[PDB]
């Protein structure tokens, strides 16, 4: 599969994290 | 325009936000 | 099927709508 | 994450279900 | 036009259907 | 970016208005 | 609601079509 | 990458065709 | 939930895999 | 296919281009 | 929010942008 | 257009590749 890349921003913290599809 | 919902939730802890389009 | 949600804002006068899948 | 929300419904009765990204 | 396939599957009946875009 | 473009239409008025991504 | 624009090609020929939203 | 399938109907004739991602 | 059908290539091994929404 | 229209804008200028699925 | 990863590519520069959601 | 990034993965065998729109 493929794996998209984001930032995450909650309130406390940000974080790139994976996405699978 | 139209306004989907959606919660951003970060640690433990979520927020309503609106997407406009 | 999934239905989904949006606020349909005209000209001034906005209204929930369903979006269905 | 973000979080959706959307109406899974079947043949006659539906549900709340989130969708998160 | 397109028209996409999925099962949906429902509490007591999955089923392919047709997507139309 | 690229831009779209869709008739909002509202309470009886359309107007083409573009979209930023 | 939003009404994006599009072609519809088949074999060598286009269609204009509205996707309501 | 993945590949989707749609039934891909114009004017003169539908085929299943793939999209390629 | 719908249940979306791809063939998932790599290396060219491909095969038929599910997409949960 | 479907072909939907955007533009794609630079630094200044833009431009129309087709988006084919 | 999320924030998405490009490169925008442009007549004469190309460059990463973020697309928020 | 802009290019997105993803991890391509088949059997254990991931890599970045570019997805133009």
Chains 1, 2, 3, 4, 5, 6, 7, 8, 9, 10, 11, 12 share one sequence.
Not at 8 to 19: P, R, T, V
Request: aromatic residues 10%; charged residues 15%; hydrophobic residues 55%.
């Amino acid at each position: 599969a493929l794996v998209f890349f984001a930032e995450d921003c909650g309130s406390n913290k940000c974080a790139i994290i994976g996405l699978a599809v």
